[PDB]
Design a protein around this motif. Sequence first.
Motif, PDB file in Angstrom:
ATOM      1  N   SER A  15      39.583  -4.556  12.412  1.00 51.00           N
ATOM      2  CA  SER A  15      40.422  -3.600  13.120  1.00 51.00           C
ATOM      3  C   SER A  15      39.796  -2.212  13.070  1.00 51.00           C
ATOM      4  CB  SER A  15      41.826  -3.577  12.510  1.00 51.00           C
ATOM      5  OG  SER A  15      42.642  -2.625  13.157  1.00 51.00           O
ATOM      6  N   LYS A  16      39.878  -1.483  14.180  1.00 51.77           N
ATOM      7  CA  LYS A  16      39.262  -0.166  14.291  1.00 51.77           C
ATOM      8  C   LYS A  16      40.092   0.695  15.234  1.00 51.77           C
ATOM      9  CE  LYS A  16      35.040   2.031  16.133  1.00 51.77           C
ATOM     10  NZ  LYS A  16      34.437   2.330  14.789  1.00 51.77           N
ATOM     11  N   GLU A  20      44.987   5.488  15.015  1.00 47.02           N
ATOM     12  CA  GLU A  20      44.961   6.466  16.098  1.00 47.02           C
ATOM     13  C   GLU A  20      45.751   5.973  17.305  1.00 47.02           C
ATOM     14  OE1 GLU A  20      41.182   8.168  16.117  1.00 47.02           O
ATOM     15  OE2 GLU A  20      41.545   9.616  17.744  1.00 47.02           O
ATOM     16  N   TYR A  21      45.696   4.673  17.576  1.00 48.98           N
ATOM     17  CA  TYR A  21      46.429   4.147  18.717  1.00 48.98           C
ATOM     18  C   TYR A  21      47.937   4.244  18.481  1.00 48.98           C
ATOM     19  CZ  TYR A  21      48.385   0.768  21.948  1.00 48.98           C
ATOM     20  OH  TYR A  21      49.147   0.163  22.907  1.00 48.98           O
ATOM     21  N   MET A  22      48.402   3.813  17.307  1.00 46.69           N
ATOM     22  CA  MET A  22      49.827   3.922  17.014  1.00 46.69           C
ATOM     23  C   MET A  22      50.277   5.379  17.030  1.00 46.69           C
ATOM     24  SD  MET A  22      50.588   1.092  14.103  1.00 46.69           S
ATOM     25  CE  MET A  22      49.199   1.622  13.090  1.00 46.69           C
ATOM     26  N   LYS A  23      49.451   6.272  16.499  1.00 47.43           N
ATOM     27  CA  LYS A  23      49.767   7.695  16.547  1.00 47.43           C
ATOM     28  C   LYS A  23      49.946   8.163  17.987  1.00 47.43           C
ATOM     29  CE  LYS A  23      47.321  11.681  14.495  1.00 47.43           C
ATOM     30  NZ  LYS A  23      46.210  11.687  15.499  1.00 47.43           N
ATOM     31  N   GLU A  24      49.069   7.712  18.888  1.00 44.38           N
ATOM     32  CA  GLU A  24      49.227   8.054  20.295  1.00 44.38           C
ATOM     33  C   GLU A  24      50.534   7.498  20.857  1.00 44.38           C
ATOM     34  OE1 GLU A  24      46.870  10.164  21.528  1.00 44.38           O
ATOM     35  OE2 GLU A  24      47.713  10.271  23.539  1.00 44.38           O
ATOM     36  N   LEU A  25      50.970   6.317  20.390  1.00 49.35           N
ATOM     37  CA  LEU A  25      52.247   5.755  20.834  1.00 49.35           C
ATOM     38  C   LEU A  25      53.456   6.514  20.312  1.00 49.35           C
ATOM     39  CD1 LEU A  25      51.783   1.904  20.302  1.00 49.35           C
ATOM     40  CD2 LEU A  25      51.996   3.022  22.535  1.00 49.35           C
ATOM     41  N   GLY A  26      53.290   7.398  19.339  1.00 47.33           N
ATOM     42  CA  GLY A  26      54.413   8.102  18.751  1.00 47.33           C
ATOM     43  C   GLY A  26      54.994   7.441  17.529  1.00 47.33           C
ATOM     44  N   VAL A  27      54.276   6.518  16.920  1.00 49.98           N
ATOM     45  CA  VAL A  27      54.774   5.787  15.765  1.00 49.98           C
ATOM     46  C   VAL A  27      54.701   6.681  14.539  1.00 49.98           C
ATOM     47  CG1 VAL A  27      54.453   3.737  14.346  1.00 49.98           C
ATOM     48  CG2 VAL A  27      53.934   3.646  16.806  1.00 49.98           C
ATOM     49  N   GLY A  28      55.762   6.662  13.721  1.00 47.80           N
ATOM     50  CA  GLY A  28      55.761   7.429  12.489  1.00 47.80           C
ATOM     51  C   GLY A  28      54.749   6.905  11.480  1.00 47.80           C
ATOM     52  N   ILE A  29      54.418   7.766  10.511  1.00 40.19           N
ATOM     53  CA  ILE A  29      53.359   7.444   9.555  1.00 40.19           C
ATOM     54  C   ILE A  29      53.730   6.211   8.737  1.00 40.19           C
ATOM     55  CG2 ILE A  29      54.307   9.125   7.941  1.00 40.19           C
ATOM     56  CD1 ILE A  29      50.603   8.133   8.182  1.00 40.19           C
ATOM     57  N   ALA A  30      55.017   6.046   8.434  1.00 38.83           N
ATOM     58  CA  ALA A  30      55.446   4.894   7.639  1.00 38.83           C
ATOM     59  C   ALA A  30      55.164   3.589   8.378  1.00 38.83           C
ATOM     60  CB  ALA A  30      56.936   5.020   7.303  1.00 38.83           C
ATOM     61  N   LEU A  31      55.594   3.512   9.641  1.00 38.58           N
ATOM     62  CA  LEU A  31      55.315   2.318  10.426  1.00 38.58           C
ATOM     63  C   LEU A  31      53.818   2.150  10.639  1.00 38.58           C
ATOM     64  CD1 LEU A  31      56.586  -0.112  11.802  1.00 38.58           C
ATOM     65  CD2 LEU A  31      56.992   1.268  13.814  1.00 38.58           C
ATOM     66  N   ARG A  32      53.077   3.252  10.803  1.00 36.91           N
ATOM     67  CA  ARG A  32      51.624   3.158  10.946  1.00 36.91           C
ATOM     68  C   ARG A  32      50.976   2.535   9.721  1.00 36.91           C
ATOM     69  NH1 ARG A  32      51.273   8.536  12.497  1.00 36.91           N
ATOM     70  NH2 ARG A  32      49.543   8.868  11.025  1.00 36.91           N
ATOM     71  N   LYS A  33      51.432   2.900   8.527  1.00 41.44           N
ATOM     72  CA  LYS A  33      50.818   2.324   7.342  1.00 41.44           C
ATOM     73  C   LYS A  33      51.204   0.865   7.185  1.00 41.44           C
ATOM     74  CE  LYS A  33      48.133   5.532   6.160  1.00 41.44           C
ATOM     75  NZ  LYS A  33      48.451   6.148   7.507  1.00 41.44           N
ATOM     76  N   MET A  34      52.462   0.528   7.460  1.00 37.47           N
ATOM     77  CA  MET A  34      52.856  -0.878   7.418  1.00 37.47           C
ATOM     78  C   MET A  34      52.054  -1.696   8.436  1.00 37.47           C
ATOM     79  SD  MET A  34      56.841  -2.192   7.275  1.00 37.47           S
ATOM     80  CE  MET A  34      57.458  -1.121   8.569  1.00 37.47           C
ATOM     81  N   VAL A 117      40.758  -7.808  21.117  1.00 39.25           N
ATOM     82  CA  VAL A 117      41.992  -7.192  21.581  1.00 39.25           C
ATOM     83  C   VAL A 117      41.756  -5.691  21.568  1.00 39.25           C
ATOM     84  CG1 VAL A 117      44.467  -6.939  21.216  1.00 39.25           C
ATOM     85  CG2 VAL A 117      43.314  -9.066  20.536  1.00 39.25           C
ATOM     86  N   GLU A 118      41.749  -5.064  22.741  1.00 37.00           N
ATOM     87  CA  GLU A 118      41.531  -3.625  22.846  1.00 37.00           C
ATOM     88  C   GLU A 118      42.813  -2.985  23.353  1.00 37.00           C
ATOM     89  OE1 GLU A 118      38.569  -2.275  25.591  1.00 37.00           O
ATOM     90  OE2 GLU A 118      38.653  -0.183  24.887  1.00 37.00           O
ATOM     91  N   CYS A 119      43.336  -2.026  22.594  1.00 33.35           N
ATOM     92  CA  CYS A 119      44.560  -1.329  22.952  1.00 33.35           C
ATOM     93  C   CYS A 119      44.200   0.092  23.340  1.00 33.35           C
ATOM     94  CB  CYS A 119      45.578  -1.326  21.813  1.00 33.35           C
ATOM     95  SG  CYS A 119      45.752  -2.901  21.000  1.00 33.35           S
ATOM     96  N   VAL A 120      44.633   0.485  24.522  1.00 35.75           N
ATOM     97  CA  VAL A 120      44.272   1.765  25.095  1.00 35.75           C
ATOM     98  C   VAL A 120      45.535   2.532  25.440  1.00 35.75           C
ATOM     99  CG1 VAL A 120      43.151   2.933  26.996  1.00 35.75           C
ATOM    100  CG2 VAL A 120      42.087   0.884  25.956  1.00 35.75           C
ATOM    101  N   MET A 121      45.511   3.824  25.145  1.00 38.78           N
ATOM    102  CA  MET A 121      46.543   4.719  25.648  1.00 38.78           C
ATOM    103  C   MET A 121      45.928   6.096  25.806  1.00 38.78           C
ATOM    104  SD  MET A 121      50.271   5.860  24.249  1.00 38.78           S
ATOM    105  CE  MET A 121      51.154   7.126  25.188  1.00 38.78           C
ATOM    106  N   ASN A 122      46.061   6.669  26.995  1.00 37.40           N
ATOM    107  CA  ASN A 122      45.411   7.938  27.299  1.00 37.40           C
ATOM    108  C   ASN A 122      43.924   7.743  27.016  1.00 37.40           C
ATOM    109  OD1 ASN A 122      47.921   8.947  28.139  1.00 37.40           O
ATOM    110  ND2 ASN A 122      48.473   9.647  26.083  1.00 37.40           N
ATOM    111  N   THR A 125      41.256   4.487  22.132  1.00 36.67           N
ATOM    112  CA  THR A 125      40.964   3.066  22.186  1.00 36.67           C
ATOM    113  C   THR A 125      40.934   2.489  20.780  1.00 36.67           C
ATOM    114  OG1 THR A 125      39.458   1.380  22.986  1.00 36.67           O
ATOM    115  CG2 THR A 125      38.486   3.461  22.173  1.00 36.67           C
ATOM    116  N   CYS A 126      41.451   1.278  20.657  1.00 34.05           N
ATOM    117  CA  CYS A 126      41.493   0.531  19.417  1.00 34.05           C
ATOM    118  C   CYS A 126      40.962  -0.865  19.699  1.00 34.05           C
ATOM    119  CB  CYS A 126      42.942   0.489  18.873  1.00 34.05           C
ATOM    120  SG  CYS A 126      43.327  -0.893  17.781  1.00 34.05           S
ATOM    121  N   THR A 127      40.208  -1.432  18.753  1.00 28.82           N
ATOM    122  CA  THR A 127      39.708  -2.795  18.899  1.00 28.82           C
ATOM    123  C   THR A 127      40.035  -3.602  17.649  1.00 28.82           C
ATOM    124  OG1 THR A 127      37.948  -2.074  20.388  1.00 28.82           O
ATOM    125  CG2 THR A 127      37.737  -4.260  19.425  1.00 28.82           C
ATOM    126  N   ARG A 128      40.602  -4.782  17.862  1.00 28.93           N
ATOM    127  CA  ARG A 128      41.006  -5.710  16.824  1.00 28.93           C
ATOM    128  C   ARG A 128      40.425  -7.075  17.147  1.00 28.93           C
ATOM    129  NH1 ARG A 128      45.178  -4.076  13.648  1.00 28.93           N
ATOM    130  NH2 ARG A 128      46.709  -5.754  13.942  1.00 28.93           N
TER     131      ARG A 128
END
Length: 134
Positions: A15-16, A20-34, A117-122, A125-128
Amino acid sequence: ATVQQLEGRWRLVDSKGFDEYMKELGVGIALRKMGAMAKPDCIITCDGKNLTIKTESTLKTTQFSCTLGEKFEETTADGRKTQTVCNFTDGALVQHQEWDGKESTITRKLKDGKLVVECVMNNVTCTRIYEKVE
Ligand SMILES: O=C(O)[C@H]1[C@H](c2ccccc2)[C@H](C(=O)Oc2cccc3ccccc23)[C@H]1c1ccccc1
Ligand SMILES: CCCCCCCCCCCCCC(=O)O
């Protein structure tokens, strides 16, 4: 090249940029770490018309089913209500999400026998990468 090559159970192996991708989605730090700590299997099933994608971690499971090419509403793990369409195009499964004038695209394709799996927003980019287990 075909959707059937994506069907089965896949285990996350790399995962890479997911934080940053979740942060772009507006996810809080707690959910990002989980979400960062999780090592979820992804199970893809397709009957020719209906696509089902299930994400399975210890004690947490989410799953959606849709008709390829038809808009539907997704309830995402972070809690967005998106209008989503999943298509198989140019050898990749493309999941397009729209909500609040925002949008994100998740592309899943076979590369060297692994699910990429590449997740893009704005401009994030994230790759898993997942390996086939079933
Ligand atoms: O609603 C909650 O309390 C939780 C959400 C949720 C759990 C299980 C199914 C669907 C949604 C979020 C969450 O746990 O996502 C995941 C994190 C890690 C792995 C996951 C694997 C599969 C599915 C979801 C996963 C929690 C949450 C907290 C705050 C705001 C929104 C969501
Ligand atoms: C299960 C991942 C953590 C969920 C909470 C953050 C929401 C991010 C949604 C995007 C995850 C899909 C990408 C993937 O299949 O690896």
